[PDB]
Amino acid sequence: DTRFHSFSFYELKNVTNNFDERPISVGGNKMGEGGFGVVYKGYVNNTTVAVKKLTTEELKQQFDQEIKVMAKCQHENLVELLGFSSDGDDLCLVYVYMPNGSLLDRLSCLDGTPPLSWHMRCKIAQGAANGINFLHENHHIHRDIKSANILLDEAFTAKISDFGLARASTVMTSRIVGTTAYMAPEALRGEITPKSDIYSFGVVLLEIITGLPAVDEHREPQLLLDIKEEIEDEEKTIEDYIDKKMNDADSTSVEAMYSVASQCLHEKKNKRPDIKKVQQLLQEMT
Ligand SMILES: CC(C)Oc1cc2c(OC[C@@H]3CCC(=O)N3)nccc2cc1C(N)=O
């Protein structure tokens, strides 16, 4: 019993051009994808929507968790679920359309979008921290904080997405989930704690500052979190790493954001700031 709309799988099929997997640029409907499904642009009730079409019973479990979590969690910095479909060939989740896609894609300037300014990145960092704070205050652990899970609306406001693996908040688990290049050491060992979301958020902050992905094989070092070491050893400077695709960054506020990222990335979970402290530091930054 939720306020979400039950759609016919056939209507979602019809409005996405039969789930046309080609990218939007070449005439299709595919906007992106991530582990459990493909995300399509649709048009329902005169409204643009995003339709995510999703092992086995575990997939139904992530569909149910996404719905249960979204019913309990509504906030300015969380993506809004509109409805779902379970009556056809496959499970679908329907959301408000995010015209600016994901932070990951906007940082890479995917499809030719202009680089995000430093002014916009600071607003995005603050928004995402506000969304995590809401989750934590409501005893939820996201478990998959990453730039692909921070969406951007019509005003480039950060909207946290993908609540399929979210947990009710420390304990251990037999099923270790998350994205390795963003995971805290205790999460890779099976610990479940909101302290891990802070670590993953530190990685997202490093992506915002540098414009670099969390992992790059043909790059060296391959993992972004390792720059914290290059810098502390005075081998490099955060300045050497600032994204060159901005014309408005200023050293002081960049260094304040790097300081927050550095505190988030403490290897010892108990030494990390909690989300309230992170929100505060990002507010003083601006
Ligand atoms: C709530 C999700 C389904 O909504 C979207 C997701 C997207 C996306 O997703 C990348 C990954 C996989 C799913 C996810 O949440 N993170 N990449 C690119 C564009 C996306 C646009 C929307 C949207 N609501 O318009």
PDB file of all heavy atoms in Angstrom, residues 123-154:
ATOM      1  N   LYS A 123      27.558  23.495  -5.057  1.00  0.00           N
ATOM      2  CA  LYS A 123      26.113  23.321  -4.759  1.00  0.00           C
ATOM      3  C   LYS A 123      25.744  21.841  -4.792  1.00  0.00           C
ATOM      4  O   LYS A 123      24.940  21.374  -3.975  1.00  0.00           O
ATOM      5  CB  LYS A 123      25.199  24.112  -5.740  1.00  0.00           C
ATOM      6  CG  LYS A 123      23.754  23.535  -5.768  1.00  0.00           C
ATOM      7  CD  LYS A 123      22.753  24.168  -6.839  1.00  0.00           C
ATOM      8  CE  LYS A 123      21.303  23.744  -6.573  1.00  0.00           C
ATOM      9  NZ  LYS A 123      20.343  24.067  -7.685  1.00  0.00           N
ATOM     10  N   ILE A 124      26.328  21.098  -5.749  1.00  0.00           N
ATOM     11  CA  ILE A 124      26.052  19.669  -5.874  1.00  0.00           C
ATOM     12  C   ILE A 124      26.578  18.895  -4.630  1.00  0.00           C
ATOM     13  O   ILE A 124      25.879  18.040  -4.092  1.00  0.00           O
ATOM     14  CB  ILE A 124      26.655  19.137  -7.205  1.00  0.00           C
ATOM     15  CG1 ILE A 124      25.911  19.704  -8.413  1.00  0.00           C
ATOM     16  CG2 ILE A 124      26.722  17.593  -7.253  1.00  0.00           C
ATOM     17  CD1 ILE A 124      26.722  19.471  -9.808  1.00  0.00           C
ATOM     18  N   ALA A 125      27.812  19.199  -4.192  1.00  0.00           N
ATOM     19  CA  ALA A 125      28.431  18.554  -3.014  1.00  0.00           C
ATOM     20  C   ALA A 125      27.570  18.808  -1.809  1.00  0.00           C
ATOM     21  O   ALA A 125      27.334  17.884  -1.052  1.00  0.00           O
ATOM     22  CB  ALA A 125      29.826  19.105  -2.761  1.00  0.00           C
ATOM     23  N   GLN A 126      27.105  20.060  -1.614  1.00  0.00           N
ATOM     24  CA  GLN A 126      26.277  20.377  -0.446  1.00  0.00           C
ATOM     25  C   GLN A 126      24.963  19.599  -0.488  1.00  0.00           C
ATOM     26  O   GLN A 126      24.523  19.076   0.531  1.00  0.00           O
ATOM     27  CB  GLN A 126      26.021  21.892  -0.353  1.00  0.00           C
ATOM     28  CG  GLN A 126      27.311  22.691  -0.090  1.00  0.00           C
ATOM     29  CD  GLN A 126      27.133  24.191  -0.263  1.00  0.00           C
ATOM     30  OE1 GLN A 126      26.323  24.669  -1.058  1.00  0.00           O
ATOM     31  NE2 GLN A 126      27.878  24.981   0.480  1.00  0.00           N
ATOM     32  N   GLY A 127      24.347  19.543  -1.666  1.00  0.00           N
ATOM     33  CA  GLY A 127      23.068  18.856  -1.861  1.00  0.00           C
ATOM     34  C   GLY A 127      23.189  17.375  -1.558  1.00  0.00           C
ATOM     35  O   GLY A 127      22.354  16.794  -0.862  1.00  0.00           O
ATOM     36  N   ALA A 128      24.207  16.736  -2.108  1.00  0.00           N
ATOM     37  CA  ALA A 128      24.401  15.311  -1.886  1.00  0.00           C
ATOM     38  C   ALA A 128      24.617  15.069  -0.381  1.00  0.00           C
ATOM     39  O   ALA A 128      24.092  14.103   0.164  1.00  0.00           O
ATOM     40  CB  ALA A 128      25.630  14.831  -2.662  1.00  0.00           C
ATOM     41  N   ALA A 129      25.382  15.960   0.303  1.00  0.00           N
ATOM     42  CA  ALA A 129      25.604  15.764   1.743  1.00  0.00           C
ATOM     43  C   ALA A 129      24.254  15.900   2.482  1.00  0.00           C
ATOM     44  O   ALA A 129      23.971  15.164   3.429  1.00  0.00           O
ATOM     45  CB  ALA A 129      26.585  16.814   2.272  1.00  0.00           C
ATOM     46  N   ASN A 130      23.420  16.833   2.036  1.00  0.00           N
ATOM     47  CA  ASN A 130      22.107  16.988   2.651  1.00  0.00           C
ATOM     48  C   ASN A 130      21.238  15.744   2.463  1.00  0.00           C
ATOM     49  O   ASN A 130      20.439  15.410   3.343  1.00  0.00           O
ATOM     50  CB  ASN A 130      21.402  18.217   2.113  1.00  0.00           C
ATOM     51  CG  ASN A 130      22.058  19.508   2.534  1.00  0.00           C
ATOM     52  OD1 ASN A 130      22.841  19.545   3.474  1.00  0.00           O
ATOM     53  ND2 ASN A 130      21.756  20.597   1.837  1.00  0.00           N
ATOM     54  N   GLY A 131      21.352  15.100   1.309  1.00  0.00           N
ATOM     55  CA  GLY A 131      20.579  13.886   1.051  1.00  0.00           C
ATOM     56  C   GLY A 131      21.053  12.728   1.905  1.00  0.00           C
ATOM     57  O   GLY A 131      20.239  11.953   2.402  1.00  0.00           O
ATOM     58  N   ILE A 132      22.378  12.613   2.115  1.00  0.00           N
ATOM     59  CA  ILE A 132      22.911  11.530   2.970  1.00  0.00           C
ATOM     60  C   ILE A 132      22.496  11.799   4.392  1.00  0.00           C
ATOM     61  O   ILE A 132      22.103  10.888   5.097  1.00  0.00           O
ATOM     62  CB  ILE A 132      24.455  11.412   2.824  1.00  0.00           C
ATOM     63  CG1 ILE A 132      24.824  11.058   1.364  1.00  0.00           C
ATOM     64  CG2 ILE A 132      25.054  10.407   3.822  1.00  0.00           C
ATOM     65  CD1 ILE A 132      26.296  11.008   1.040  1.00  0.00           C
ATOM     66  N   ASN A 133      22.540  13.054   4.816  1.00  0.00           N
ATOM     67  CA  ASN A 133      22.133  13.379   6.172  1.00  0.00           C
ATOM     68  C   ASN A 133      20.688  12.971   6.411  1.00  0.00           C
ATOM     69  O   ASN A 133      20.349  12.460   7.475  1.00  0.00           O
ATOM     70  CB  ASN A 133      22.294  14.863   6.453  1.00  0.00           C
ATOM     71  CG  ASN A 133      21.844  15.197   7.855  1.00  0.00           C
ATOM     72  OD1 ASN A 133      22.453  14.780   8.832  1.00  0.00           O
ATOM     73  ND2 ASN A 133      20.696  15.843   7.983  1.00  0.00           N
ATOM     74  N   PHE A 134      19.835  13.188   5.437  1.00  0.00           N
ATOM     75  CA  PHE A 134      18.436  12.810   5.612  1.00  0.00           C
ATOM     76  C   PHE A 134      18.374  11.297   5.799  1.00  0.00           C
ATOM     77  O   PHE A 134      17.712  10.829   6.722  1.00  0.00           O
ATOM     78  CB  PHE A 134      17.570  13.254   4.406  1.00  0.00           C
ATOM     79  CG  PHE A 134      16.137  12.780   4.548  1.00  0.00           C
ATOM     80  CD1 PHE A 134      15.198  13.542   5.228  1.00  0.00           C
ATOM     81  CD2 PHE A 134      15.735  11.571   4.011  1.00  0.00           C
ATOM     82  CE1 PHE A 134      13.887  13.105   5.360  1.00  0.00           C
ATOM     83  CE2 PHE A 134      14.414  11.141   4.135  1.00  0.00           C
ATOM     84  CZ  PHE A 134      13.504  11.908   4.815  1.00  0.00           C
ATOM     85  N   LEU A 135      19.083  10.527   4.932  1.00  0.00           N
ATOM     86  CA  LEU A 135      19.090   9.055   5.033  1.00  0.00           C
ATOM     87  C   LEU A 135      19.522   8.596   6.413  1.00  0.00           C
ATOM     88  O   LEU A 135      18.845   7.781   7.040  1.00  0.00           O
ATOM     89  CB  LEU A 135      20.001   8.432   3.943  1.00  0.00           C
ATOM     90  CG  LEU A 135      19.410   8.459   2.529  1.00  0.00           C
ATOM     91  CD1 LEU A 135      20.469   8.133   1.466  1.00  0.00           C
ATOM     92  CD2 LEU A 135      18.194   7.501   2.418  1.00  0.00           C
ATOM     93  N   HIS A 136      20.674   9.098   6.879  1.00  0.00           N
ATOM     94  CA  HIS A 136      21.251   8.726   8.168  1.00  0.00           C
ATOM     95  C   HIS A 136      20.359   9.093   9.355  1.00  0.00           C
ATOM     96  O   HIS A 136      20.200   8.293  10.286  1.00  0.00           O
ATOM     97  CB  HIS A 136      22.662   9.333   8.290  1.00  0.00           C
ATOM     98  CG  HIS A 136      23.665   8.646   7.407  1.00  0.00           C
ATOM     99  ND1 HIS A 136      25.024   8.920   7.499  1.00  0.00           N
ATOM    100  CD2 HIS A 136      23.473   7.703   6.461  1.00  0.00           C
ATOM    101  CE1 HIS A 136      25.605   8.146   6.598  1.00  0.00           C
ATOM    102  NE2 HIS A 136      24.712   7.383   5.960  1.00  0.00           N
ATOM    103  N   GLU A 137      19.757  10.293   9.318  1.00  0.00           N
ATOM    104  CA  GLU A 137      18.856  10.751  10.371  1.00  0.00           C
ATOM    105  C   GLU A 137      17.678   9.791  10.426  1.00  0.00           C
ATOM    106  O   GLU A 137      17.122   9.574  11.485  1.00  0.00           O
ATOM    107  CB  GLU A 137      18.325  12.163  10.060  1.00  0.00           C
ATOM    108  CG  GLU A 137      19.225  13.302  10.506  1.00  0.00           C
ATOM    109  CD  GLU A 137      18.652  14.670  10.187  1.00  0.00           C
ATOM    110  OE1 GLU A 137      17.648  14.734   9.440  1.00  0.00           O
ATOM    111  OE2 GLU A 137      19.206  15.679  10.682  1.00  0.00           O
ATOM    112  N   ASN A 138      17.298   9.219   9.288  1.00  0.00           N
ATOM    113  CA  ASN A 138      16.188   8.280   9.229  1.00  0.00           C
ATOM    114  C   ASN A 138      16.664   6.829   9.280  1.00  0.00           C
ATOM    115  O   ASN A 138      15.991   5.932   8.777  1.00  0.00           O
ATOM    116  CB  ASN A 138      15.282   8.552   8.031  1.00  0.00           C
ATOM    117  CG  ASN A 138      14.483   9.834   8.189  1.00  0.00           C
ATOM    118  OD1 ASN A 138      13.357   9.838   8.695  1.00  0.00           O
ATOM    119  ND2 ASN A 138      15.084  10.967   7.860  1.00  0.00           N
ATOM    120  N   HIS A 139      17.837   6.606   9.895  1.00  0.00           N
ATOM    121  CA  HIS A 139      18.400   5.279  10.105  1.00  0.00           C
ATOM    122  C   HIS A 139      18.503   4.396   8.864  1.00  0.00           C
ATOM    123  O   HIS A 139      18.226   3.206   8.938  1.00  0.00           O
ATOM    124  CB  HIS A 139      17.615   4.565  11.229  1.00  0.00           C
ATOM    125  CG  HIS A 139      17.283   5.483  12.363  1.00  0.00           C
ATOM    126  ND1 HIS A 139      18.253   5.912  13.248  1.00  0.00           N
ATOM    127  CD2 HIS A 139      16.106   6.068  12.687  1.00  0.00           C
ATOM    128  CE1 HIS A 139      17.637   6.726  14.091  1.00  0.00           C
ATOM    129  NE2 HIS A 139      16.345   6.856  13.787  1.00  0.00           N
ATOM    130  N   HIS A 140      18.941   4.955   7.741  1.00  0.00           N
ATOM    131  CA  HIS A 140      19.118   4.181   6.518  1.00  0.00           C
ATOM    132  C   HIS A 140      20.576   4.265   6.128  1.00  0.00           C
ATOM    133  O   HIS A 140      21.158   5.335   6.233  1.00  0.00           O
ATOM    134  CB  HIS A 140      18.254   4.773   5.371  1.00  0.00           C
ATOM    135  CG  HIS A 140      16.807   4.442   5.512  1.00  0.00           C
ATOM    136  ND1 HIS A 140      16.295   3.246   5.045  1.00  0.00           N
ATOM    137  CD2 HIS A 140      15.817   5.136   6.117  1.00  0.00           C
ATOM    138  CE1 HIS A 140      15.010   3.257   5.362  1.00  0.00           C
ATOM    139  NE2 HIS A 140      14.674   4.382   5.993  1.00  0.00           N
ATOM    140  N   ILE A 141      21.172   3.154   5.683  1.00  0.00           N
ATOM    141  CA  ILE A 141      22.548   3.156   5.185  1.00  0.00           C
ATOM    142  C   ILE A 141      22.391   2.941   3.689  1.00  0.00           C
ATOM    143  O   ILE A 141      21.712   1.982   3.308  1.00  0.00           O
ATOM    144  CB  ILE A 141      23.386   2.019   5.798  1.00  0.00           C
ATOM    145  CG1 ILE A 141      23.350   2.104   7.334  1.00  0.00           C
ATOM    146  CG2 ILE A 141      24.821   2.095   5.241  1.00  0.00           C
ATOM    147  CD1 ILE A 141      23.962   0.888   8.079  1.00  0.00           C
ATOM    148  N   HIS A 142      22.970   3.819   2.837  1.00  0.00           N
ATOM    149  CA  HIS A 142      22.764   3.663   1.380  1.00  0.00           C
ATOM    150  C   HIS A 142      23.491   2.436   0.781  1.00  0.00           C
ATOM    151  O   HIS A 142      22.878   1.655   0.031  1.00  0.00           O
ATOM    152  CB  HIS A 142      23.107   4.980   0.651  1.00  0.00           C
ATOM    153  CG  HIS A 142      22.809   4.964  -0.817  1.00  0.00           C
ATOM    154  ND1 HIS A 142      23.565   4.203  -1.699  1.00  0.00           N
ATOM    155  CD2 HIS A 142      21.887   5.670  -1.519  1.00  0.00           C
ATOM    156  CE1 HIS A 142      23.082   4.483  -2.911  1.00  0.00           C
ATOM    157  NE2 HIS A 142      22.064   5.351  -2.851  1.00  0.00           N
ATOM    158  N   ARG A 143      24.778   2.252   1.169  1.00  0.00           N
ATOM    159  CA  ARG A 143      25.678   1.162   0.772  1.00  0.00           C
ATOM    160  C   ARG A 143      26.243   1.287  -0.635  1.00  0.00           C
ATOM    161  O   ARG A 143      27.129   0.520  -0.993  1.00  0.00           O
ATOM    162  CB  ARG A 143      25.113  -0.247   1.025  1.00  0.00           C
ATOM    163  CG  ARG A 143      24.741  -0.527   2.485  1.00  0.00           C
ATOM    164  CD  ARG A 143      24.811  -2.017   2.801  1.00  0.00           C
ATOM    165  NE  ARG A 143      23.744  -2.756   2.136  1.00  0.00           N
ATOM    166  CZ  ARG A 143      23.730  -4.075   1.980  1.00  0.00           C
ATOM    167  NH1 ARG A 143      24.739  -4.815   2.425  1.00  0.00           N
ATOM    168  NH2 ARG A 143      22.710  -4.664   1.372  1.00  0.00           N
ATOM    169  N   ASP A 144      25.750   2.233  -1.427  1.00  0.00           N
ATOM    170  CA  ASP A 144      26.284   2.416  -2.778  1.00  0.00           C
ATOM    171  C   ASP A 144      26.399   3.882  -3.186  1.00  0.00           C
ATOM    172  O   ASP A 144      25.993   4.270  -4.294  1.00  0.00           O
ATOM    173  CB  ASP A 144      25.536   1.568  -3.829  1.00  0.00           C
ATOM    174  CG  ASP A 144      26.426   1.162  -5.015  1.00  0.00           C
ATOM    175  OD1 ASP A 144      27.663   1.469  -4.987  1.00  0.00           O
ATOM    176  OD2 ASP A 144      25.897   0.562  -5.968  1.00  0.00           O
ATOM    177  N   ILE A 145      26.996   4.699  -2.307  1.00  0.00           N
ATOM    178  CA  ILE A 145      27.203   6.109  -2.636  1.00  0.00           C
ATOM    179  C   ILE A 145      28.281   6.214  -3.736  1.00  0.00           C
ATOM    180  O   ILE A 145      29.402   5.737  -3.550  1.00  0.00           O
ATOM    181  CB  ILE A 145      27.609   6.909  -1.363  1.00  0.00           C
ATOM    182  CG1 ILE A 145      26.443   6.953  -0.336  1.00  0.00           C
ATOM    183  CG2 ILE A 145      28.103   8.328  -1.747  1.00  0.00           C
ATOM    184  CD1 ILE A 145      25.073   7.518  -0.912  1.00  0.00           C
ATOM    185  N   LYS A 146      27.953   6.851  -4.859  1.00  0.00           N
ATOM    186  CA  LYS A 146      28.918   7.025  -5.948  1.00  0.00           C
ATOM    187  C   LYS A 146      28.383   8.068  -6.916  1.00  0.00           C
ATOM    188  O   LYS A 146      27.194   8.363  -6.888  1.00  0.00           O
ATOM    189  CB  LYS A 146      29.189   5.689  -6.654  1.00  0.00           C
ATOM    190  CG  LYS A 146      27.966   5.014  -7.273  1.00  0.00           C
ATOM    191  CD  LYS A 146      28.456   3.700  -7.928  1.00  0.00           C
ATOM    192  CE  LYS A 146      27.308   2.920  -8.501  1.00  0.00           C
ATOM    193  NZ  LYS A 146      27.836   1.684  -9.164  1.00  0.00           N
ATOM    194  N   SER A 147      29.234   8.620  -7.777  1.00  0.00           N
ATOM    195  CA  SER A 147      28.763   9.686  -8.677  1.00  0.00           C
ATOM    196  C   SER A 147      27.709   9.168  -9.683  1.00  0.00           C
ATOM    197  O   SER A 147      26.912   9.949 -10.159  1.00  0.00           O
ATOM    198  CB  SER A 147      29.942  10.353  -9.393  1.00  0.00           C
ATOM    199  OG  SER A 147      30.625   9.363 -10.153  1.00  0.00           O
ATOM    200  N   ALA A 148      27.687   7.862  -9.992  1.00  0.00           N
ATOM    201  CA  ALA A 148      26.627   7.375 -10.888  1.00  0.00           C
ATOM    202  C   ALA A 148      25.275   7.391 -10.145  1.00  0.00           C
ATOM    203  O   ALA A 148      24.213   7.335 -10.778  1.00  0.00           O
ATOM    204  CB  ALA A 148      26.923   5.957 -11.340  1.00  0.00           C
ATOM    205  N   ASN A 149      25.311   7.467  -8.797  1.00  0.00           N
ATOM    206  CA  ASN A 149      24.076   7.463  -7.998  1.00  0.00           C
ATOM    207  C   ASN A 149      23.730   8.841  -7.444  1.00  0.00           C
ATOM    208  O   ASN A 149      23.011   8.948  -6.443  1.00  0.00           O
ATOM    209  CB  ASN A 149      24.144   6.359  -6.877  1.00  0.00           C
ATOM    210  CG  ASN A 149      24.011   4.989  -7.486  1.00  0.00           C
ATOM    211  OD1 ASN A 149      23.534   4.848  -8.610  1.00  0.00           O
ATOM    212  ND2 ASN A 149      24.428   3.941  -6.780  1.00  0.00           N
ATOM    213  N   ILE A 150      24.240   9.909  -8.089  1.00  0.00           N
ATOM    214  CA  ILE A 150      23.891  11.263  -7.697  1.00  0.00           C
ATOM    215  C   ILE A 150      23.387  11.887  -8.975  1.00  0.00           C
ATOM    216  O   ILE A 150      24.165  12.116  -9.881  1.00  0.00           O
ATOM    217  CB  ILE A 150      25.094  12.032  -7.110  1.00  0.00           C
ATOM    218  CG1 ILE A 150      25.553  11.341  -5.780  1.00  0.00           C
ATOM    219  CG2 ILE A 150      24.713  13.509  -6.880  1.00  0.00           C
ATOM    220  CD1 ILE A 150      26.888  11.883  -5.275  1.00  0.00           C
ATOM    221  N   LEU A 151      22.085  12.074  -9.085  1.00  0.00           N
ATOM    222  CA  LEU A 151      21.499  12.557 -10.298  1.00  0.00           C
ATOM    223  C   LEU A 151      21.326  14.051 -10.216  1.00  0.00           C
ATOM    224  O   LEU A 151      21.404  14.633  -9.117  1.00  0.00           O
ATOM    225  CB  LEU A 151      20.151  11.846 -10.560  1.00  0.00           C
ATOM    226  CG  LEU A 151      20.302  10.309 -10.559  1.00  0.00           C
ATOM    227  CD1 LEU A 151      18.986   9.645 -10.916  1.00  0.00           C
ATOM    228  CD2 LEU A 151      21.383   9.826 -11.594  1.00  0.00           C
ATOM    229  N   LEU A 152      21.114  14.669 -11.392  1.00  0.00           N
ATOM    230  CA  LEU A 152      21.033  16.137 -11.520  1.00  0.00           C
ATOM    231  C   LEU A 152      19.738  16.589 -12.223  1.00  0.00           C
ATOM    232  O   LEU A 152      19.449  16.205 -13.370  1.00  0.00           O
ATOM    233  CB  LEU A 152      22.320  16.623 -12.225  1.00  0.00           C
ATOM    234  CG  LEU A 152      23.635  16.292 -11.448  1.00  0.00           C
ATOM    235  CD1 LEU A 152      24.876  16.535 -12.326  1.00  0.00           C
ATOM    236  CD2 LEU A 152      23.757  17.129 -10.163  1.00  0.00           C
ATOM    237  N   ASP A 153      18.914  17.335 -11.484  1.00  0.00           N
ATOM    238  CA  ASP A 153      17.621  17.765 -11.985  1.00  0.00           C
ATOM    239  C   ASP A 153      17.718  19.000 -12.882  1.00  0.00           C
ATOM    240  O   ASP A 153      18.825  19.395 -13.269  1.00  0.00           O
ATOM    241  CB  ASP A 153      16.588  17.954 -10.843  1.00  0.00           C
ATOM    242  CG  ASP A 153      16.709  19.254 -10.064  1.00  0.00           C
ATOM    243  OD1 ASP A 153      17.740  19.980 -10.251  1.00  0.00           O
ATOM    244  OD2 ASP A 153      15.782  19.557  -9.267  1.00  0.00           O
ATOM    245  N   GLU A 154      16.561  19.587 -13.189  1.00  0.00           N
ATOM    246  CA  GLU A 154      16.392  20.766 -14.049  1.00  0.00           C
ATOM    247  C   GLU A 154      17.187  22.000 -13.530  1.00  0.00           C
ATOM    248  O   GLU A 154      17.369  22.945 -14.283  1.00  0.00           O
ATOM    249  CB  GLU A 154      14.875  21.109 -14.177  1.00  0.00           C
ATOM    250  CG  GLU A 154      14.265  21.582 -12.857  1.00  0.00           C
ATOM    251  CD  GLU A 154      12.760  21.732 -12.805  1.00  0.00           C
ATOM    252  OE1 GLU A 154      12.105  21.444 -13.828  1.00  0.00           O
ATOM    253  OE2 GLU A 154      12.237  22.173 -11.756  1.00  0.00           O
TER     254      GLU A 154
END
